[PDB]
């Protein structure tokens, strides 16, 4: 069993030893250089259809927390933009910092945001998530940057349950949460082919990164930083800086949906 994390001893610079694809040709995240990304007038409109989303549970996995959805049918899907076909929402999670100046995985002209939200979807033509991650077009991850300013009301239900899942392996019922409340106003985006940003680092993701960040309050993000990487009763290691830094772009082009 693997023992990866974000510390000096088991962090991103170590991952390549168990997961050699870490040094691959389409690794994520990347820096988005806004003056090199090209507007692509042929990107179709992005369609976020979350009306029938069914959230189930929230889990501290020792790396982040995941809000899990019922993906047994087409209840919450992402279509359009660069995507062919239908991608089903399976979960969302975040990456964040110890301080507001770092936390995001993607960067924008080298700017790091305080946090990044990842809504993870799988291509329904592959039948299940485990089959989808074996395909170059198996996943679509919608990435949303968080900056610290005004509170995000649609996030507070998440923040308030975190006290009940402080430590690794803890979960809580998390029904009737509406992920539409985490979106910015604009769906303008950048897109590029990449990977999972955690082990196993599989090169199966179409990344769609929204240009407009959402604002969250310092109180909201401070509560993210009170979670623990450790399990119950173990010495406290605060769950902070659970982000992978930018990876080489290699032979890839980042496309913009907007001028």
Name the binding residues for Zn(2+).
93, 95, 118
Interaction between residue 130 and ligand EO7 (CB under 6 A): yes
Binding mask 137-166 for ligand EO7 (x = CB under 6 A): ----x-------------------------
CB of 231 to Na ion, least distance (A): 35
Place of tokens 């929230």: 58
Q: Which does 130 bind (CB under 5 to 8 A by kind): ligand EO7, Zn ion, Na ion, none?
A: ligand EO7
Residues 4 and 197: beta-carbon distance below 8 Å = no
In angstroms, rounded to a whole number, what is the distance separating the alpha carbons of residues 204 and 224?
28
Interaction between residue 169 and ligand EO7 (CB under 6 A): no
What H or E segment, with its residue span, contains residue 95? strand 87-96
Of residues 101 through 140, those in contact with Zn ion by CB under 5 A are 118
**70: which 2 tokens?**
């019922």
CB of 65 to Na ion, least distance (A): 22
Count of residues interacting with ligand EO7 (CB under 6 A): 12
The answer to whether residue 35 is catalytic is no
- Scanning 88-96, 145-153, 190-198, 214-222 for contacts with Na ion by CB under 5 A, the matching segment is 214-222
Residues 76 and 105: beta-carbon distance below 8 Å = no
Between residues 89 and 133, which has the closer beta carbon with respect to ligand EO7?
133
CB-based burial, 199-225: b 16+ in 10 Å, e otherwise? bbbbbbbbbbbbbebbbbbeebbebbb
Residues 6+ apart with CB under 8 A from 232: 167, 168, 169, 170
In angstroms, rounded to a whole number, what is the distance separating the alpha carbons of residues 25 and 175?
39
β-pair type (205-210, 107-108): unpaired
Residues near Zn ion (CB under 5 A) are 118
* Residues labelled catalytic: 63
Binding site for ligand EO7 (CB under 6 A): 66, 91, 93, 118, 120, 130, 133, 141, 196-198, 200
**Residues of this chain that bind Na ion (CB under 5 A):** 184, 214
């Amino acid at each position: 069993s693997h023992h990866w994390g974000y510390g000096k001893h088991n962090g991103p610079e170590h991952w390549h030893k168990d997961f050699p694809i870490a040094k691959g040709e389409r690794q994520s995240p990347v820096d988005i250089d806004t003056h090199t990304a090209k507007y692509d007038p042929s990107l179709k409109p992005l369609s976020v259809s979350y009306d029938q989303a069914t959230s189930l549970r929230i889990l501290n996995n020792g790396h982040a927390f995941n809000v899990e959805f019922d993906d047994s049918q087409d209840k919450a899907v992402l279509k359009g933009g660069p995507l062919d076909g239908t991608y089903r929402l399976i979960q969302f999670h975040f990456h964040w910092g110890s301080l507001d100046g770092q936390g995001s995985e993607h960067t924008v002209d080298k700017k790091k945001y305080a946090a990044e939200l990842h809504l993870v979807h799988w291509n329904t033509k592959y039948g299940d998530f485990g089959k989808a991650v074996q395909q170059p077009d198996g996943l679509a991850v919608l990435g949303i940057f968080l900056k610290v300013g005004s509170a995000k009301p649609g996030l507070q239900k998440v923040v308030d349950v975190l006290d009940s899942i402080k430590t690794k392996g803890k979960s809580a019922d998390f029904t009737n949460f509406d992920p539409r409340g985490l979106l910015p106003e604009s769906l303008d985006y950048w897109t590029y082919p990449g990977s999972l940003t955690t082990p196993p680092l599989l090169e199966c993701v179409t990344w769609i990164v929204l240009k407009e960040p959402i604002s969250v309050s310092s109180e909201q993000v401070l509560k993210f930083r009170k979670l623990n990487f450790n399990g119950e009763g173990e010495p406290e290691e605060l769950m902070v800086d659970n982000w992978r830094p930018a990876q080489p772009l290699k032979n890839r082009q980042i496309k913009a949906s907007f001028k």
